[PDB]
Design a protein around this ligand. Sequence first.
Ligand SMILES: C[C@@H]1CC[C@@]2(OC1)O[C@H]1C[C@H]3[C@@H]4CC=C5C[C@@H](OCC[C@H](CO)CO[C@@H]6O[C@H](CO)[C@@H](O[C@H]7O[C@H](CO)[C@@H](O)[C@H](O)[C@H]7O)[C@H](O)[C@H]6O)CC[C@]5(C)[C@H]4CC[C@]3(C)[C@H]1[C@@H]2C
Ligand SMILES: C[C@@H]1CC[C@@]2(OC1)O[C@H]1C[C@H]3[C@@H]4CC=C5C[C@@H](OCC[C@H](CO)CO[C@@H]6O[C@H](CO)[C@@H](O[C@H]7O[C@H](CO)[C@@H](O)[C@H](O)[C@H]7O)[C@H](O)[C@H]6O)CC[C@]5(C)[C@H]4CC[C@]3(C)[C@H]1[C@@H]2C
Ligand SMILES: C[C@@H]1CC[C@@]2(OC1)O[C@H]1C[C@H]3[C@@H]4CC=C5C[C@@H](O)CC[C@]5(C)[C@H]4CC[C@]3(C)[C@H]1[C@@H]2C
Ligand SMILES: C[C@@H]1CC[C@@]2(OC1)O[C@H]1C[C@H]3[C@@H]4CC=C5C[C@@H](O)CC[C@]5(C)[C@H]4CC[C@]3(C)[C@H]1[C@@H]2C
Ligand SMILES: *[C@@H]1O[C@H](CO)[C@@H](O)[C@H](O)[C@H]1NC(C)=O
Ligand SMILES: *[C@@H]1O[C@H](CO)[C@@H](O)[C@H](O)[C@H]1NC(C)=O
Lengths: 309, 622
Amino acid sequence: DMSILKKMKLYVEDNWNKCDMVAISLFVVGLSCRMAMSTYEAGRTVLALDFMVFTLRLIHIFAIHKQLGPKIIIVERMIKDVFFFLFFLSVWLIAYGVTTQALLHPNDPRIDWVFRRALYRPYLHIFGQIPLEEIDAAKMPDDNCTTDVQEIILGTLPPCPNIYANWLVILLLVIYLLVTNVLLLNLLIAMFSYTFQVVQENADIFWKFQRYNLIVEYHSRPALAPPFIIISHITQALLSFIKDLLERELPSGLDQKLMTWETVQKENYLAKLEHEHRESSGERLRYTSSKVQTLLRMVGGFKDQEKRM
Amino acid sequence: VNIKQFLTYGRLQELYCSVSEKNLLHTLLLKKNQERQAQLKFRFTFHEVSKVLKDFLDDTCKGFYQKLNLPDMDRRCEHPWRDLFLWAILQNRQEMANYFWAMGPEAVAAALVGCKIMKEMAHLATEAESARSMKNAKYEQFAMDLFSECYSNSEDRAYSLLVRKTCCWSKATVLNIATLAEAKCFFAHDGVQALLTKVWWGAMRTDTSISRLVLTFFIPPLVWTSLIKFNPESATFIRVVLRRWNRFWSAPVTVFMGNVIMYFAFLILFSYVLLLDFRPPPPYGPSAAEIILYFWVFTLVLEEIRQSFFTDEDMSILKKMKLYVEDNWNKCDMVAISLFVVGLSCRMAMSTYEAGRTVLALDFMVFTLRLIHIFAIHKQLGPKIIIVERMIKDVFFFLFFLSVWLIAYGVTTQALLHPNDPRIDWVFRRALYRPYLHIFGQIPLEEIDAAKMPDDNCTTDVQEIILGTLPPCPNIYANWLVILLLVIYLLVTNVLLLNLLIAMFSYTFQVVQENADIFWKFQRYNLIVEYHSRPALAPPFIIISHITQALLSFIKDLLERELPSGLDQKLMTWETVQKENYLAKLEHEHRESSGERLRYTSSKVQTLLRMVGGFKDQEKRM
Ligand SMILES: C[C@@H]1CC[C@@]2(OC1)O[C@H]1C[C@H]3[C@@H]4CC=C5C[C@@H](OCC[C@H](CO)CO[C@@H]6O[C@H](CO)[C@@H](O[C@H]7O[C@H](CO)[C@@H](O)[C@H](O)[C@H]7O)[C@H](O)[C@H]6O)CC[C@]5(C)[C@H]4CC[C@]3(C)[C@H]1[C@@H]2C
Ligand SMILES: C[C@@H]1CC[C@@]2(OC1)O[C@H]1C[C@H]3[C@@H]4CC=C5C[C@@H](OCC[C@H](CO)CO[C@@H]6O[C@H](CO)[C@@H](O[C@H]7O[C@H](CO)[C@@H](O)[C@H](O)[C@H]7O)[C@H](O)[C@H]6O)CC[C@]5(C)[C@H]4CC[C@]3(C)[C@H]1[C@@H]2C
Ligand SMILES: C[C@@H]1CC[C@@]2(OC1)O[C@H]1C[C@H]3[C@@H]4CC=C5C[C@@H](O)CC[C@]5(C)[C@H]4CC[C@]3(C)[C@H]1[C@@H]2C
Ligand SMILES: C[C@@H]1CC[C@@]2(OC1)O[C@H]1C[C@H]3[C@@H]4CC=C5C[C@@H](O)CC[C@]5(C)[C@H]4CC[C@]3(C)[C@H]1[C@@H]2C
Ligand SMILES: *[C@@H]1O[C@H](CO)[C@@H](O)[C@H](O)[C@H]1NC(C)=O
Ligand SMILES: *[C@@H]1O[C@H](CO)[C@@H](O)[C@H](O)[C@H]1NC(C)=O
């Protein structure tokens, strides 16, 4: 008993369910395009992407593992620092790449190659891919290059790089390499270290809380793994047409006994708290001070009476 | 003793003249007195204390004692507790200053003024003990605690208390005094941040999701729907829809995001002009998009100038220029505009066309860097900006170490490998450029290892080497030493220095993050204050708003508001009551402390011992 729309909303709420929906949609689209001949290659491409989606689903499958689940939670938390580093790197990379593309190839109309030399190459500079053959004049090859735009567009010859102020290009490359490959990367390492230290303890508790739900799900899951699971599904459907260790209901006597036992344990726990409060140092100090004040006034009266005699 | 009747102005000046002569206040008063005598009954006149207060605050203590120039010497002070607190504060007497603050009418402003004056005198302090006491004035702590009490009490009168114009401190807003004091911890308080968030979202509700706001921004008509909830409070209907439109588009957050979107449009247009639509000199004419870009930047500079200079009605032009050039990001802005002007000028010519293109290429980088300062206000990004700004120092330390090691290794290898290359450019190349690239996995062994050196056509003659006919042959006399030095350099640089820098960044992050958050909040206050007066139209449109403002000025605030006399007095009495409650709570917590109870018990036990001993002696006598 639950609303169908509410169930759909609850399902689509989870991100891993969104990944599952993406996977099944890609499978359907790839199969449909594969069935045709004019869209065969597109279907193959979509299925290739779907394999990646399923292999990623494998992580959510392993989420219940006792040693791996907290790591999944930790990575899910690290995503935020990843995004911060992405913002910084994106700003710096846009700047450096567009500036170098303007300084080096100011007469290349090809939009694809503009975007290439502006963003793809500076991005690969991070991972040790620094092709100086296109950036340093002393290292630029004596290849057959053209300056004419027409010939450049047709792709007859590669466009010659501008070497007007190449010292500026090399200086900018040096500064970009420093900033990106040192400051940003080591800053991200520090951010991950701090985030790990602050998050791990909460990640363990969250893993336990999620483990409860995963075990609850595994309770009703049929014992047959897919693709066999169809036998169990058919059996369940046939049984439903023809016709739990957790969340059990107990007899009245046992239920009342457990309720009284809970009440007794609660009384014991409250008595222990109160006793520990009475024996606390602060409470003892307060009691001693109050009783000393009372004793002072009373013994002062007694001493006055004694002096009267 | 009735302080109101006790403290006359003559008595106040008598107190000021009777300084200890061994503290900082006496030295400052002597300096002011000598300056006044050079510019030309009582050792010091109210002019000297007024000038000292002018040095310390420069805006608040105006007319405190100059208004009447001296007032009647027998006339009682209008604000006795304020003057007493100020007097006790100028001379580092903190216990007395505290007592006077506990009696003053406006306590938050007084505490902020006190902390400002203390941190101002901390620099001028001669003795180390006095400076240490001044740095621990904890007067900002008093303001934070009292405002926490006030915020817990009402949370609606607290905002009015923050934004009201105080009567004692020359119509100065409490937030204005906190800004003057640079009380960063005060701005970090949850109440001040909540008020700033309320200002940030304008008429909209602060809980509005960012995605809904962006979607409503991109599709304007959805403002009239119920997608975003608003805070409460033919001709009528038009007025209603216009009011809703204005209440949405006047919010500071919408103005900020519009500015960000149009700055992204600027970066896109600048890149397009620089990469695809950069035409020959004006003989063939700059592109129309280039003219649009020039107009764009003109509007941006107009907005910058207006924000920096025309926001303040009364302030020295030279002082405003100094304040503007003080900020580093303003220096970056000046560099950007100067580069734009130089690049445009060189582009207008034909003999300097390429230089102009190069300068504009650099300017694009400068503007894309300006984008970070634009995003500084973001709730999740700003602290990261602060953290990076702090990391710069460790970057410099690593740079020093790397520079020393790199100079050594590079010059040694250039001497060992190419001892007969006269070309200065290639000497500097092989000495510094190549060892620098060794850090990033660029190790060209084809020029360093003889077993890997190519059978290319090389010359040994210097003449031929200089002319560039053939590349100079590398020396292979002792190449085992070159390879050993390369190995040692690779080890040191790529392992020790890099992992040391990683450790330095880790430690710096851990130590800095908490202060960076508070500094972000303190800066967020000023950014929201700036967004208050910023016109709601993002550039290049902003020119319409500028023209409208100029026309309105020729023809003719939620923060820092002034309240009616009755409400002002009510809030002052409420502040006094909250201060009394806070002090009573502190005193009660002090009485119930374990140490105080132990002291009381010990003293009373001693008294009881002696008294009961006397009683026992009396009993034994019977
Ligand atoms: C510790 C810290 C590290 C980072 C840094 O600061 C210090 O290091 C600094 C070092 C510096 C660099 C030091 C040196 C230079 C060189 C200088 O050019 C000199 C001007 C001349 C005039 O155009 C250029 O020369 C000639 O160009 C020609 C290109 O047409 C070459 O023709 C080639 O044609 C064909 C190529 O296919 C082949 O026949 C041959 O290959 C060759 O014949 C010549 O061979 C070559 O002679 C430009 C500046 C630069 C790169 C410095 C930049 C800044 C640094 C990296 C510093 C860092 C901040
Ligand atoms: C764990 C730790 C790591 C770091 C380290 O310590 C341990 O490792 C050690 C290893 C060691 C190195 C071990 C070995 C050597 C070799 C030694 O040369 C032997 C002397 C002879 C005499 O000149 C040189 O040989 C010959 O040179 C000729 C150059 O004219 C080559 O001609 C080439 O000509 C043309 C090239 O275009 C082509 O025809 C062919 O390419 C080739 O014919 C010959 O082929 C080659 O036979 C020099 C020292 C060196 C590099 C050691 C240095 C120190 C280490 C890195 C240690 C670390 C601390
Ligand atoms: C991470 C972002 C995604 C979006 C984007 O920038 C990076 O991707 C880039 C890829 C570019 C493509 C790459 C190749 C070609 C082919 C060429 O004949 C015509 C131009 C066109 C379509 C380009 C148009 C602009 C595009 C989408 C860029 C776009 C801002
Ligand atoms: C980070 C520092 C900046 C300053 C500096 O060292 C690194 O830059 C280096 C670049 C060098 C240039 C590079 C190219 C040439 C061209 C050549 O035909 C004549 C010599 C000259 C001008 C060189 C002179 C010495 C220079 C400025 C070096 C200078 C100490
Ligand atoms: C470049 O193209 C020209 C066309 O005539 C040809 O003569 C020359 O040999 C080519 N050079 C190279 C390096 O391919
Ligand atoms: C080097 O130059 C000489 C000049 O005569 C030439 O004979 C020889 O073939 C050249 N070798 C190479 C590898 O270019």
